[PDB]
Scaffold this active site. Structure first.
Site, PDB file in Angstrom:
ATOM      1  CG  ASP A   1      -1.982   1.102   1.150  1.00 20.27           C
ATOM      2  OD1 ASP A   1      -1.933   1.949   0.238  1.00 20.27           O
ATOM      3  OD2 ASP A   1      -2.850   1.154   2.044  1.00 20.27           O
ATOM      4  CB  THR A   2       2.097   3.435  -2.789  1.00 21.08           C
ATOM      5  OG1 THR A   2       0.877   3.703  -3.486  1.00 21.08           O
ATOM      6  CG2 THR A   2       2.866   2.317  -3.477  1.00 21.08           C
ATOM      7  N   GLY A   3      -0.147   4.158  -0.298  1.00 19.86           N
ATOM      8  CA  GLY A   3      -0.864   5.227   0.417  1.00 19.86           C
ATOM      9  C   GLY A   3      -0.800   5.147   1.943  1.00 19.86           C
TER      10      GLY A   3
HETATM   11  C1  LIG Z   1      -3.239   2.007   6.983  1.00 18.14           C
HETATM   12  C2  LIG Z   1      -3.100   3.450   7.468  1.00 18.14           C
HETATM   13  C3  LIG Z   1      -1.680   3.645   8.000  1.00 18.14           C
HETATM   14  C4  LIG Z   1      -4.112   3.757   8.575  1.00 18.14           C
HETATM   15  N1  LIG Z   1      -3.284   4.357   6.340  1.00 18.14           N
HETATM   16  C5  LIG Z   1      -4.415   4.596   5.640  1.00 18.14           C
HETATM   17  O1  LIG Z   1      -5.529   4.101   5.811  1.00 18.14           O
HETATM   18  C6  LIG Z   1      -4.247   5.643   4.577  1.00 18.14           C
HETATM   19  C7  LIG Z   1      -4.858   6.950   5.099  1.00 18.14           C
HETATM   20  C8  LIG Z   1      -4.683   8.078   4.087  1.00 18.14           C
HETATM   21  C9  LIG Z   1      -5.292   9.394   4.580  1.00 18.14           C
HETATM   22  C10 LIG Z   1      -6.819   9.380   4.560  1.00 18.14           C
HETATM   23  C11 LIG Z   1      -7.361   8.994   3.189  1.00 18.14           C
HETATM   24  C12 LIG Z   1      -6.786   7.647   2.756  1.00 18.14           C
HETATM   25  C13 LIG Z   1      -5.260   7.679   2.734  1.00 18.14           C
HETATM   26  C14 LIG Z   1      -4.717   6.332   2.294  1.00 18.14           C
HETATM   27  N2  LIG Z   1      -4.890   5.262   3.309  1.00 18.14           N
HETATM   28  C15 LIG Z   1      -4.437   4.008   2.796  1.00 18.14           C
HETATM   29  C16 LIG Z   1      -5.216   3.310   1.933  1.00 18.14           C
HETATM   30  O2  LIG Z   1      -4.623   2.781   0.852  1.00 18.14           O
HETATM   31  C17 LIG Z   1      -6.364   2.540   2.530  1.00 18.14           C
HETATM   32  C18 LIG Z   1      -5.783   1.216   3.071  1.00 18.14           C
HETATM   33  C19 LIG Z   1      -6.803   0.176   3.464  1.00 18.14           C
HETATM   34  C20 LIG Z   1      -6.926  -0.977   2.691  1.00 18.14           C
HETATM   35  C21 LIG Z   1      -7.849  -1.963   3.030  1.00 18.14           C
HETATM   36  C22 LIG Z   1      -8.652  -1.798   4.155  1.00 18.14           C
HETATM   37  C23 LIG Z   1      -8.533  -0.652   4.931  1.00 18.14           C
HETATM   38  C24 LIG Z   1      -7.611   0.336   4.586  1.00 18.14           C
HETATM   39  N3  LIG Z   1      -7.470   2.334   1.604  1.00 18.14           N
HETATM   40  C25 LIG Z   1      -8.747   2.723   1.807  1.00 18.14           C
HETATM   41  O3  LIG Z   1      -9.176   3.295   2.790  1.00 18.14           O
HETATM   42  C26 LIG Z   1      -9.668   2.424   0.665  1.00 18.14           C
HETATM   43  C27 LIG Z   1     -10.872   3.340   0.443  1.00 18.14           C
HETATM   44  C28 LIG Z   1     -11.478   2.939  -0.892  1.00 18.14           C
HETATM   45  N4  LIG Z   1     -12.729   2.498  -0.884  1.00 18.14           N
HETATM   46  O4  LIG Z   1     -10.827   2.992  -1.917  1.00 18.14           O
HETATM   47  N5  LIG Z   1     -10.073   1.040   0.663  1.00 18.14           N
HETATM   48  C29 LIG Z   1     -10.286  -0.227   0.322  1.00 18.14           C
HETATM   49  O5  LIG Z   1      -9.868  -0.488  -0.803  1.00 18.14           O
HETATM   50  C30 LIG Z   1     -10.957  -1.286   1.162  1.00 18.14           C
HETATM   51  C31 LIG Z   1     -11.084  -2.559   0.615  1.00 18.14           C
HETATM   52  C32 LIG Z   1     -11.701  -3.575   1.338  1.00 18.14           C
HETATM   53  C33 LIG Z   1     -12.191  -3.309   2.610  1.00 18.14           C
HETATM   54  C34 LIG Z   1     -12.812  -4.312   3.350  1.00 18.14           C
HETATM   55  C35 LIG Z   1     -13.303  -4.039   4.623  1.00 18.14           C
HETATM   56  C36 LIG Z   1     -13.177  -2.757   5.151  1.00 18.14           C
HETATM   57  C37 LIG Z   1     -12.547  -1.760   4.407  1.00 18.14           C
HETATM   58  C38 LIG Z   1     -12.051  -2.026   3.131  1.00 18.14           C
HETATM   59  N6  LIG Z   1     -11.441  -1.053   2.406  1.00 18.14           N
END
Ligand SMILES: CC(C)(C)NC(=O)[C@@H]1C[C@@H]2CCCC[C@@H]2CN1C[C@@H](O)[C@H](Cc1ccccc1)NC(=O)[C@H](CC(N)=O)NC(=O)c1ccc2ccccc2n1
Lengths: 99, 99
Positions: free
Chosen positions: A25-27
């Site tokens: 996860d690059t984000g």
């Molecule tokens: C992991 C952590 C260190 C907390 N970082 C982050 O969460 C940062 C926060 C940043 C600032 C706020 C906006 C988002 C960015 C990017 N994110 C990363 C980022 O890449 C984040 C990682 C992730 C993956 C899977 C499940 C949960 C979370 N993705 C997401 O939040 C995106 C939102 C979307 N619908 O596209 N999610 C999903 O693709 C996703 C997929 C399946 C799931 C199943 C159950 C519950 C949640 C699920 N979310």
């Protein structure tokens, strides 16, 4: 190797003899794993996701094998629906984005 | 370009004549931008990540230029803490992970 984005970029990880899947996860600034007992002292931390903040536990210098590549660093543990490998460890295995 | 991960992989996007900063985000399925006005009928949508659900507005077939690369796809708009470019659009610009 090269990892394509047509599906979720999930890879096998190995940590303390545990075999798990995780998102590359690059984000993510940080690496967040599902719940597990890791050794050592943990500090509480509040981190931001898309839905708001969650409380997690920070363990340091945790070794983890990512896709056959050794990495060692800070690992957060909390209520995540997925194991997430963040930039802190992604840089260690020489991961880039290309386009 | 090749983009490394010691800093957040943030790039300028152009959308609707507006310039914005957004995060290249392999761990996101979807592209989610902060509140703004886009033209079109939009569907209300709920998405999820860490911290839980977000209510967003789904706009389809939106042209968006990412670091000079053209995409036309779905843009979700809502109270995300940060603009993110997800796999739906990363794939359109030929973006891969490499280590
Ligand atoms: C992991 C952590 C260190 C907390 N970082 C982050 O969460 C940062 C926060 C940043 C600032 C706020 C906006 C988002 C960015 C990017 N994110 C990363 C980022 O890449 C984040 C990682 C992730 C993956 C899977 C499940 C949960 C979370 N993705 C997401 O939040 C995106 C939102 C979307 N619908 O596209 N999610 C999903 O693709 C996703 C997929 C399946 C799931 C199943 C159950 C519950 C949640 C699920 N979310």
């Amino acid at each position: 190797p090269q990892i394509t984005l047509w599906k979720r970029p999930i890879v096998t990880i190995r940590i303390g003899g545990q075999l798990k899947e995780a998102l590359l996860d690059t984000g993510a600034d940080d690496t967040v794993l599902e719940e597990m007992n890791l050794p050592g002292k943990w500090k509480p931390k509040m981190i931001v996701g898309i839905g708001g903040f969650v409380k997690v536990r920070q363990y340091d210098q945790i070794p983890i094998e990512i896709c056959g590549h050794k990495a060692i660093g800070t690992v957060l543990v909390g209520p995540t629906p997925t194991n997430i490998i963040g930039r802190n460890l992604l840089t260690q295995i020489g991961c880039t984005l290309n386009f």
